[PDB]
C-alpha cells in the first residue's frame, strides 16, 4: 500500500533533520536510503497551476506499506503545499523541539492541518539530546496535548514519541536515537489507518462534455475521480441546476463499451431520459445522496503573494472573484469575518464564500481563485452551509 506523510512544526525545530532520520533508519533492510541532509534541504521549486512551492518529496517503504514523505523549507511553502494539495497527507508528524515547543508556527500549523483536513497527527519531539531534564519535557508534552485538543484533534490519546534526529543520523542506539525513530515508524505503521482508495470512495465524476447519440440517449464525458459506474447504477446530477435523477445505461470509451467506469480514467457514460440541454459542464455525477450542492461555504484560503504571480492588491470583504471547481468557474463573493477587513497578500485565513449558483461540494474539496486568468489565491472547503 501507499501512504502520504509529512513533518510539520516550527522552523529550526528539525523537520528536515528528522525526515533524513526516518530515511536513514528505514534504510535498514534497504526499505529506504541513507539520505543526506543537504539534498533534502535543497527542495526543488515547481510552479504548478500558477502556484510555486518548495517541496522535498522523500520516499521510503516499510514491511507494512510504502510512504510518501513531504518536507518544506518554510512556513509559506508548508501553507502552499497543504492548501494546493500537491499530495494530501493523511498523517502528519508534528515535530516539536524539546525546548520552546509551542511556537506560533506550530500554533498555525496545527490549525492549518485541521482546516485542510488532515485526519491524524502523530507527535514526535526532538532536541531531547539538548535537554537534560524530565519535568519540562512533561510540561511540553502537556502543552502539545492541550494544543491538539484545542483544535478537535485527540491529544489525550495522541501517540507522543521522544528522540533526537541528530543521534538517529549518528547511529547511536541510545533510546533518543534509532530506538526513537523505530517506534515512530511503528506508530506510523499502526496508528495511521490505510487510506481509502479512489475506486473505493463513493462514485463521483465531474461532467466535462455533453453529447447525444441517436438511439442511446445523453452521453456526458469526464474523468471519474472516485468509485465505479456500471450499467444499471442509479446516479444523480448535482451542480448548477437542481438535482436531477437518472440511470446509467452504458459506459463507453472510444466508441466501444466498457464493463464499468473506474476512478482515474476518462470514460464516458450514458444517461437514461435526460436531454442534451438538461445537463451541462460543471455539474457532477454522483451516487444519490453522496454529495449536495451549496452556495455558502467557509474555506481556508491562501492569498498568493506577488512572488508566485499572485496579485498586487489585498483581498477585502465584498471582493467577488471567480472560483474554479474541477470543471467550471463560478463567481463567488468573499465574505470575511469580524475584525478581518484587510487580508494581506501572502497570508492565509478562513473566509465565507457565496457563489452565484450552487456547486456540488463537500468538506475537503479544493479550488482556485482567479481573475482574468491570473491565480490570486488557492483554497480548500472547510464547511458547507445552506
Amino acid at each position: 500500500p501507499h501512504v502520504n506523510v509529512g513533518t510539520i512544526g516550527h522552523v529550526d525545530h528539525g523537520k528536515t533533520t528528522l525526515t533524513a532520520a526516518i530515511a536513514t533508519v528505514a534504510a535498514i533492510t534497504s526499505g529506504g536510503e541513507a539520505k543526506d541532509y543537504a539534498s533534502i534541504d535543497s527542495a526543488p521549486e515547481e510552479k504548478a497551476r500558477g502556484i510555486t512551492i518548495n517541496t522535498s518529496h522523500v520516499e521510503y517503504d516499510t514491511p507494512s506499506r510504502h510512504y510518501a514523505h513531504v518536507d518544506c523549507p518554510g512556513h509559506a511553502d508548508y501553507v502552499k503545499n497543504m492548501i494546493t494539495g500537491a499530495a494530501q497527507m493523511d498523517g502528519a508528524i508534528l515535530v516539536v523541539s524539546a525546548t520552546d515547543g509551542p511556537m506560533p508556527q506550530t500554533r498555525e500549523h496545527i490549525l492549518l492541518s485541521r482546516q485542510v483536513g488532515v485526519p491524524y497527527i502523530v507527535v514526535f519531539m526532538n532536541k531531547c539530546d539538548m535537554v537534560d531534564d524530565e519535568e519540562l519535557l512533561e510540561l511540553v508534552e502537556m502543552e502539545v496535548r492541550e494544543l491538539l485538543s484545542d483544535y478537535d484533534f485527540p491529544g489525550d490519546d495522541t501517540p507522543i514519541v521522544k528522540g533526537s534526529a541528530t543521534e538517529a543520523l549518528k547511529g547511536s542506539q541510545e533510546k533518543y536515537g534509532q530506538p526513537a525513530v523505530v517506534e515512530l515508524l511503528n506508530i506510523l505503521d499502526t496508528y495511521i489507518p490505510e487510506p481509502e482508495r479512489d475506486i473505493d470512495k463513493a462514485f463521483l465524476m465531474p461532467i466535462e462534455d455533453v453529447f447525444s447519440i441517436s438511439g442511446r440517449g445523453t452521453v456526458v464525458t469526464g474523468r471519474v475521480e472516485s468509485g465505479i459506474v456500471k450499467v444499471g447504477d442509479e446516479i444523480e446530477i448535482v451542480g448548477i441546476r437542481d438535482t436531477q435523477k437518472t440511470t446509467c445505461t452504458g459506459v463507453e470509451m472510444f466508441r466501444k463499451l466498457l464493463d464499468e467506469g473506474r476512478a482515474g480514467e476518462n470514460c464516458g457514460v450514458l444517461l437514461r431520459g435526460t436531454k442534451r440541454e438538461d445537463v451541462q459542464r460543471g455539474q457532477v455525477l454522483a451516487k444519490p445522496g453522496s454529495i449536495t450542492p451549496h452556495t455558502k461555504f467557509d474555506a481556508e484560503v491562501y492569498v498568493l503573494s506577488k512572488e508566485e504571480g499572485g496579485r498586487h492588491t489585498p483581498f477585502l470583504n465584498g471582493y467577488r472573484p471567480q472560483f474554479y471547481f474541477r470543471t467550471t468557474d463560478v463567481t463567488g463573493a468573499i465574505q470575511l469575518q469580524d475584525g478581518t477587513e484587510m487580508v494581506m497578500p501572502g497570508d492565509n485565513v478562513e473566509m465565507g464564500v457565496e457563489l452565484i449558483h450552487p456547486i456540488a461540494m463537500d468538506k475537503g474539496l479544493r479550488f482556485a481563485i482567479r481573475e482574468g486568468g491570473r491565480t490570486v489565491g488557492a483554497g480548500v472547503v472547510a464547511n458547507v452551509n445552506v
Binding site: 525546548t99 520552546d100 515547543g101 509551542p102 535537554v131 519540562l136 510540561l139 511540553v140
Partner: peptide
Amino acid sequence: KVGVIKAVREATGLGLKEAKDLVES
C-alpha cells in the same frame, strides 16, 4: 507554576526552558 511559566513566556518571547528557569530562579 505552569500558568506562571506560560505568562512569562508570552510576556518575554523566550523559550519554554528559559521561561521555566527564570520562573524557578
